[PDB]
Every structure is written in structure tokens, then in C-alpha cells.
């Protein structure tokens, strides 16, 4: 399976600050036939299942705020939250749906200082 | 990682018929401390990313119709669609979020005869 490695494991920050998290895939998820990145980000709030946040590396899922921005390509991706809000506190996972079994990184937990 | 094995690989059916698909995990996803099954089902329509359908083995995600029913426990789960509708045609994946890396089965493609 393709291995997804994220960093940092956990990120502490205060409300309103910018947050950036990285993700690297053991092999490229950029398909040479259509130039699309089969890379998604899922948001997992405490005690909840992972919910789709972003896909195609940079496309936002219905209902996701503009403050969330996915970028990167090939094997290196990044999720950026320009100004972290209270409702954004959760563990974020990058995942590849390039080839089965689709796989997840081990996540980055975003907390608010304390 | 926990291995998720689904069956059948593909299921053909006509509009309105009942559809049942199975999923087995290589190890139990029933947590003995709270008796919850960290098992979810994701729906992947053609050309789209996997979207949350059911979690906690039987709880429906916001917006999911009553015709979808998740059941099972431990290592054996089942997704049942009482009367398949046109919009339900897609590949369904079971996934465990019991322990990282969260993993997906290789899916079951539901098609409408032809
Ligand atoms: Zn592997
Ligand atoms: Zn394994």
C-alpha cells in the first residue's frame, strides 16, 4: 500500500493564527494520464469519524470554509488554515485514493494552546 | 495495519432491488472499553472521492436515506440497501478507524444491470 506520512504529529496554536500541516506519499499520487492528484484531506473532530474536507489536492468539499487551502502535487502536499477557528480543532488526515487499498496518514492533531 | 476484505467485488442489480454487501476486518474493531465498533462505510461515486455514508457500524451520516442500513459487529459487517435507487450507483468501501493508519477495503462496485 502507499504510505502517507504527516508532520508534525501535533500542532498547538491560538485562535486566529495560521496553521500549516504537511503530508508526503511514499509514491506519487499524480496520475500521468490526466494530471490529477488523487489526494484528499479528511477532518476528524474528537469522537467522530473522518469527514471529507478537501480532494484533488486543492478542491474544497461542500460546506468547507475558504480559510482551508490544500496545495502541493506528486508526493508532497500541504493543508493551510489561514486563521484557525474554534470549530477547526481536530485531527487532520491526508489520504490517497490513487490505488486500493486507499490509505491514510496517521494524522496531525490541531489544538488550541493549553 | 488492519486489513479490510469486502465481498463481492462487484454486484449487478436492477433499480429498486435489495442489495447486500459484506466486509470483514482482519482483527476486531469492537473496542472492549466502550463497546463501540469503529467501522464506517464510504460511498464513492464514479470520478469522486470517498464520502462518509455510515459510521459506528450503523449510524447514518447527515443526509443519508433510510434505505441504507449498516449492521454487524466485531469483525463482520454488512451494508444493506433495501431498494437501490439511481443515485446509489457507486463503489462502496468499508473502513476502520479503530487504529491508525485507518484502512479501507478494496470496495464493492454496485451497478445497474447492463
Ligand atoms: Zn504498502
Ligand atoms: Zn497490516
Swiss-Prot record, chains A, B:
Any GO molecular function: antigen binding
Region (Complementarity-determining-2), start-end ranges: 56-62
Region (Framework-2), start-end ranges: 41-55
Compartments, as annotated in UniProt: Secreted; Cell membrane
Biological-process GO terms, alphabetical: adaptive immune response; immune response
Record key words, sorted: Adaptive immunity, Cell membrane, Disulfide bond, Immunity, Immunoglobulin, Immunoglobulin domain, Membrane, Secreted, Signal
Region annotated Complementarity-determining-3, chain positions: 95-101
Residue ranges of the region described as Complementarity-determining-1: 24-40
Sequence ranges assigned to domain Ig-like in this UniProt record: 1-101
Disulfide bonds: 23-94
Subunit organization: Immunoglobulins are composed of two identical heavy chains and two identical light chains; disulfide-linked.
Function: V segment of the variable domain of immunoglobulins light chain that participates in the antigen recognition. Immunoglobulins, also known as antibodies, are membrane-bound or secreted glycoproteins produced by B lymphocytes. In the recognition phase of humoral immunity, the membrane-bound immunoglobulins serve as receptors which, upon binding of a specific antigen, trigger the clonal expansion and differentiation of B lymphocytes into immunoglobulins-secreting plasma cells.
UniProt-recorded name of the protein: Immunoglobulin kappa variable 4-1
Organism field: Homo sapiens
Interval of the full protein contained in this chain: 21 to 121 of 121
